Design a binder for this molecule. Structure first.
Ligand SMILES: *[C@@H]1O[C@H](CO)[C@@H](O[C@@H]2O[C@H](CO)[C@@H](O[C@@H]3O[C@H](CO)[C@@H](O)[C@H](O[C@H]4O[C@H](CO)[C@@H](O)[C@H](O)[C@@H]4O)[C@@H]3O)[C@H](O)[C@H]2NC(C)=O)[C@H](O)[C@H]1NC(C)=O
Ligand SMILES: *[C@@H]1O[C@H](CO)[C@@H](O[C@@H]2O[C@H](CO)[C@@H](O)[C@H](O)[C@H]2NC(C)=O)[C@H](O)[C@H]1NC(C)=O
Ligand SMILES: CCCCCCCCO[C@@H]1O[C@H](CO)[C@@H](O)[C@H](O)[C@H]1O
Ligand SMILES: CCCCCCCCO[C@@H]1O[C@H](CO)[C@@H](O)[C@H](O)[C@H]1O
Ligand SMILES: CCCCCCCCO[C@@H]1O[C@H](CO)[C@@H](O)[C@H](O)[C@H]1O
Ligand SMILES: *C(=O)CCCCCCCCCCCCCCC
Ligand SMILES: *C(=O)CCCCCCCCCCCCCCC
Lengths: 11, 326
């Protein structure tokens, strides 16, 4: 989910 | 007998000495030193100095960085815009009124100010919620094969706006009302006078339940699910250092965001709730600002939390601020 995290500004 | 009522105001000081004037007519120096007014002025100045740039720079950067204009970022933009209403609608005004020692703009000014002031705050607040919901949706994939796009982002934002109006507009039209709060320099939702032609009592409940408990429960559930979704994903990927880090970093971010959301609205809520339970008990003009202090200053730390720590926005800001790059 690293991808989606980087999409959310979270990671 | 601790207050002085007026057609359009509640001065939290007792006119038994006969010194209390309408906070729309004359300086309220009898409920707080002129210096403390300046300190107020000072703080408004600080919030404007920091608040404006951070929030403006946010928009500005988005206009100049293709990559930022993804639809999962709209709610953040929305946030900054909201912070800007808080700056120009709230801060600047106060800075200006505080320096007169009273609300020099009168009733309708009060209303304008209160409306835009509370409008922004509500928008910002509801963004923080909407943002939570979105991340939950995006990251925890609670929906079969759903994929987040521009339209959602748009609704998400629109919703924010609605919720805000759902709260700031009523006062303008007789459900609660805007009166000079605290030291009578800024205008706020009347949550502490049982003033009944407007029904503050109920409205405050509506506020407390709909605009504090809903948000809190939603933000808590959402980030709860997220920090669970990520914690779990890592336990299932212990081989992948990044996933580990990500979990660690997301948790840290959630704790920040939540603790931050609380620091911002707990005070208001907590105070409202108290006042709504401890009647006739007087609250000083300054004590009535403590809550405002935490909320207004959020216009700086929210952008620090939701924008400046968001890795992209940051890189963009840095790039922009340093002309060339890094
Ligand atoms: C906080 O407390 C103070 C004191 O209670 C209060 O201020 C008082 O307000 C009244 C008005 O509501 C002021 O009185 C005026 O007094 C002057 C005296 O200089 C009168 O001449 C005025 O007028 C009368 O007589 C006229 C005949 O020609 C009539 O045509 C006219 O209609 C008036 O009847 C008027 O009465 C009073 O001066 C102040 N006192 C002080 C110390 O300022 C104040 O309003 C309270 N604060 C709040 C928010 O309520
Ligand atoms: C004015 O403000 C004071 C708060 O400091 C109120 O005082 C208290 O009075 C109530 C009586 O109903 C008691 O519950 C508290 O024990 C009192 N506390 C203290 C520290 O004295 C007061 O009620 C308010 N208004 C009036 C008319 O007294
Ligand atoms: C008379 C000159 C005052 C200078 C000393 C500043 C005191 C700082 O402390 C202040 O004291 C006030 C008393 O007016 C309290 O009402 C305020 O709550 C408090 O912030
Ligand atoms: C951004 C800074 C705005 C400047 C604010 C100036 C507010 C003026 O303030 C007022 O000025 C009057 C002088 O006529 C005094 O008599 C009043 O007591 C004072 O409150
Ligand atoms: C409401 C949003 C949730 C708040 C943060 C979730 C709790 C984070 O706390 C985490 O709990 C873990 C226990 O599983 C510990 O092992 C971690 O050290 C700690 O980071
Ligand atoms: C492109 O590289 C130009 C930007 C580099 C100059 C940075 C100078 C930093 C100035 C800090 C401002 C502090 C003043 C705040 C109080 C008024
Ligand atoms: C590019 O060359 C960098 C210039 C960017 C200037 C921004 C600095 C603003 C000054 C505010 C001071 C930050 C205080 C932080 C508290 C720990």
């Amino acid at each position: 989910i690293l991808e989606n995290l980087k999409d959310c500004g979270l990671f | 007998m601790n207050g002085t009522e007026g057609p359009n105001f509640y001065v939290p000081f007792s006119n038994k000495t006969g010194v209390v004037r309408s906070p729309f007519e004359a300086p309220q120096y009898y409920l707080a030193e002129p210096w403390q007014f300046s300190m107020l002025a000072a703080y408004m100045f600080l919030l404007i100095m920091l608040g404006f740039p951070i929030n403006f720079l946010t928009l500005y950067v988005t206009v100049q960085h293709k990559k930022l204009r993804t639809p999962l970022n709209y709610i953040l933009l929305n946030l900054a815009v909201a912070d800007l209403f808080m700056v120009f609608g709230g801060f600047t005004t106060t800075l200006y009124t505080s320096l007169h020692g009273y609300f020099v703009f009168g009733p309708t000014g009060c209303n304008l100010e209160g409306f835009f002031a509370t409008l922004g705050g509500e928008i910002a607040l509801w963004s923080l919620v909407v943002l939570a919901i979105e991340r939950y949706v995006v990251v925890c994939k609670p929906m079969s094969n759903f994929r987040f796009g521009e339209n959602h982002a748009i609704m998400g934002v629109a919703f924010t706006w609605v919720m805000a109006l759902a709260c700031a507009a009523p006062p303008l039209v007789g459900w609660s009302r805007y009166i000079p709060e605290g030291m009578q320099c800024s205008c706020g939702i009347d949550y502490y006078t049982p003033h009944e032609e407007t029904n503050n009592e109920s409205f405050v409940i509506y506020m407390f339940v709909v605009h504090f408990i809903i948000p809190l429960i939603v933000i808590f559930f959402c980030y709860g699910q997220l920090v669970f979704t990520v914690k779990e994903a890592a336990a299932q990927q212990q081989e992948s250092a990044t996933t580990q880090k990500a979990e660690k970093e997301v948790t840290r971010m959630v704790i920040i965001m939540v603790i931050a959301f609380l620091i911002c609205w707990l005070p208001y809520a907590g105070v409202a709730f108290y006042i709504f339970t401890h009647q006739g008990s007087d609250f000083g003009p300054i004590f009535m600002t403590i809550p405002a202090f935490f909320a207004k200053t959020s216009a700086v730390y929210n952008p620090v939390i939701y924008i400046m720590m968001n890795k992209q926005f940051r890189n963009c800001m840095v790039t922009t601020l340093c002309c060339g790059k890094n």
